[PDB]
Design a binder for these strands. Sequence first.
DNA 1: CGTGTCAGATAATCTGACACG
DNA 2: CGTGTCAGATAATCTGACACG
Lengths: 72, 72
Amino acid sequence: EKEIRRSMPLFPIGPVMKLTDLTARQIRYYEDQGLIHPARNQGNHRLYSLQDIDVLLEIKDYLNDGLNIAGI
Amino acid sequence: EKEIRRSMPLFPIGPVMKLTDLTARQIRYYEDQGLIHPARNQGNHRLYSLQDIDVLLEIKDYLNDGLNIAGI
DNA sequence: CGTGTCAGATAATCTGACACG
DNA sequence: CGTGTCAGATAATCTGACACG
């Protein structure tokens, strides 16, 4: 009942910039890097999931201390 | 721990049109009618809350059967 | 008395290439 | 090898007035 409401693509890239402190440039750099694949809009926007937002914070925490992308 | 994550204004009027079947014209008609007050963006957009989305469905159910606005 | 649709704005997001300590 | 910022597009949202069975 949890892996359905969260994994549903609901937010655009704006609100997720508010939750995190990540810049659209950071959040979209991780897309063409091979570790996050959020849904697309009818207008080719990016829908992020509630658990995908947690995944963008999984990276946020693995980057305030420091780490590359090939490692994660 | 529930009346904080929900009541936080997070969605714009687009995603809430997806959850409901309500048109932006309906969702914004209820604003200038005196029964819903969602937050504004820096760009003067409308942030809806997760419990505000429930309130827009409270109206959705009180309108498939039929009812005015002065009553609710 | 509730909602579709228009037309002209403004904010938000797209991809592409360039910049740099 | 990760991110700011640019410039020109397109989708998304604003307010205002008009339409109608």
